[PDB]
Amino acid sequence: CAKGCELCSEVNGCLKCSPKLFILLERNDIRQVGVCLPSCPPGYFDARNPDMNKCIKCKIEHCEACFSHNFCTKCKEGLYLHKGRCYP
Numbered sequence: 001c002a003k004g005c006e007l008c009s010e011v012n013g014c015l016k017c018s019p020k021l022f023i024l025l026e027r028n029d030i031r032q033v034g035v036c037l038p039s040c041p042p043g044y045f046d047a048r049n050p051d052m053n054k055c056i057k058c059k060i061e062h063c064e065a066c067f068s069h070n071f072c073t074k075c076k077e078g079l080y081l082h083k084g085r086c087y088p
């Protein structure tokens with residue numbers, strides 16, 4: 001498929017990277033394209049699993065982790081997590 005890509009599509013590029021790499025999915029002109037990166041861009045949480053690592057957009061203030069796009073699942077110490085956002 002490509003460097004570090006274990007599963008790819010002729011249309012959507014990489015869909016599953018090697019376990020050591022992070023998949024970044026970004027939509028281009030009504031199409032989705034996947035890239036395998038050694039780490040995630042700014043504002044993305046580096047979600048890690050035994051079989052798969054993924055960059056999840058996590059532009060939530062005071063947030064430490066997002067399981068799904070822009071929805072916080074763990075706030076910084078001292079903050080209260082409520083419906084994907086963190087509160088003083």
Ligand SMILES: [Ho]
Nearest residue numbers: 060061062088
């Ligand atoms: Ho803020």
Ligand SMILES: [Ho]
Nearest residue numbers: 064075076077
């Ligand atoms: Ho933390």
